[PDB]
């Protein structure tokens, strides 16, 4: 033992001695973006960088007095005037403008409100779920195409009838049918700006903090033409009308009332299409599910025994399969199963092909696989309770 004890004392001192000298030397060693084109930029950008073009201390107008009154964002009020050649139409109420750094005078007006920025990170950039991805050829998928896609691609046909085109549509049902799987699909195909919100993103402790948000999001959607504002998971901020008399339901119900007064509006909505993906229409509020704002409402159904024979064609054609797997045969054996569980028979036959050491998933690995996932994921009803009615 003793010959090797004297070698455990070196291993301890030595691994840390090395370690400090190597990380300080390596450093970021002077790596700063720009690279090879920024040397030609140095000719152009040195005569402008010295100009006072910048800085313009950004301010914001509080009163046009038929001259102009700005309020700096430091709190100190000044009366300024026109610039080099700006039109007197540019200066509007509550608009930000840049003013000369020294003696204050409007040089260049600037777009409005610096509260938008928590609302530009909610906008996604063309999802990859395509439009044939969704199961069946149901008539319910064409109703999504008759409320959103069709009146914006051709407003010629809804102008001859005379009808106000239906603008809303509600997607509701049991989970696993794709409420978000068909709202991604429709964001790929329509090429209209999609604006996803999380309805449980608004909540904070400081009341009417989600009032600011809801306002500015609603304006940001008003400016771009053809938009779709997809509110997911509005069971929080979309609850029943009640009044506990003692809790903190008072913060919660602020953000809903502000959601109500913009939807209908003094100034109607201007080419905004409305989607709601809810789990339940059962607790949802009586002022949101009241029909001018919902228009036409299509509940997405549990696929029938023909709807699962259709769906089973999307997941078994992409796997490598021997020829002659009747898609009716595995759909029968299965009980009443969503399409999110009918996707998991392919994945459990794919993990059993690897165990059995097969390069092909066959009709034998799918018969076993059914038995395992139907038992397994059926047993134990999550909470196996729920209720909370009486």
């Amino acid at each position: 033992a003793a010959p090797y004890a004297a070698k455990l004392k070196q291993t301890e001192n030595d691994l840390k001695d090395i370690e400090a000298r190597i990380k300080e030397k390596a450093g970021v060693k002077e790596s700063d973006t720009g690279l090879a084109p920024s040397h030609l930029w140095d000719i152009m950008g040195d005569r402008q960088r010295l100009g006072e073009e910048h800085p313009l201390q950004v301010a914001r107008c509080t009163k046009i007095i038929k001259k102009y009154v700005i309020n700096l964002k430091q709190i100190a009020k000044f009366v300024v005037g026109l610039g080099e050649r700006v039109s007197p139409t540019d200066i509007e109420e509550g608009m930000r403008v840049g003013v000369d750094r020294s003696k204050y005078n409007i040089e260049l007006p600037l777009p409005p409100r610096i509260d938008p920025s928590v609302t530009m990170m909610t906008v996604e950039e063309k999802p990859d779920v395509t439009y044939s991805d969704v199961g069946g050829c149901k008539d319910q998928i064409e109703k999504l195409r008759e409320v959103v896609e069709l009146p914006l691609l051709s407003p010629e046909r809804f102008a001859t009838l005379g009808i106000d085109p239906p603008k809303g549509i509600l997607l509701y049902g049991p989970p696993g049918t794709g409420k978000t799987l068909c709202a991604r699909a429709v964001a790929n195909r329509t090429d209209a700006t999609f604006i996803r919100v999380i309805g449980s993103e608004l909540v904070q402790k400081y009341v009417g903090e989600g009032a600011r948000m809801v306002r500015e999001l609603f304006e940001m959607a008003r400016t771009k033409k053809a938009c779709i504002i997809f509110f997911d998971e509005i069971d929080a901020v979309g609850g029943a009308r009640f009044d506990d008399g003692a809790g903190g339901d008072n913060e919660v119900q602020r953000t809903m009332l502000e959601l109500i007064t913009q939807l209908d509006g003094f100034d109607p909505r201007g080419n905004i299409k409305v989607m709601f993906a809810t789990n339940r229409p059962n607790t949802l509020d009586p002022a949101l599910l009241r029909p001018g704002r919902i228009d036409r409402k299509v509940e997405f159904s549990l696929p029938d025994l023909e709807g699962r024979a259709n769906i089973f064609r999307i997941h078994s054609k992409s796997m490598s399969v021997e020829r002659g797997i009747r898609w009716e045969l595995i759909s029968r054996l299965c009980p009443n199963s969503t399409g999110a569980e009918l996707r998991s028979v392919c994945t459990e036959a794919g993990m059993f092909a690897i165990r059995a050491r097969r390069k092909v998933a066959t009709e034998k690995d799918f018969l076993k696989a059914v038995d395992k996932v139907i038992s397994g994921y059926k047993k134990f009803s999550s909470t196996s309770r729920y209720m909370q009615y009486n």
Partner: protein, 54 residues
């Protein structure tokens, strides 16, 4: 601009009966309901402001 119409769309934002409350943000909300009732009392030059409320 008196007489003029202030139209309040909704009124359940400040119209809580609850202003005897026990640790809630009703102590900030209720402060804009009571500044209402003072700016609704008679002191003339407000005898000519009306109100709709839905």
């Amino acid at each position: 601009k008196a007489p003029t119409i202030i139209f309040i769309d909704e009124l359940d934002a400040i119209g809580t009966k609850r202003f005897d409350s026990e640790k809630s943000g009703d102590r900030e909300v209720q402060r804009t309901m009571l500044e209402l009732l003072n700016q609704l009392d008679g002191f003339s030059s407000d005898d000519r402001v009306k109100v709709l409320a839905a």
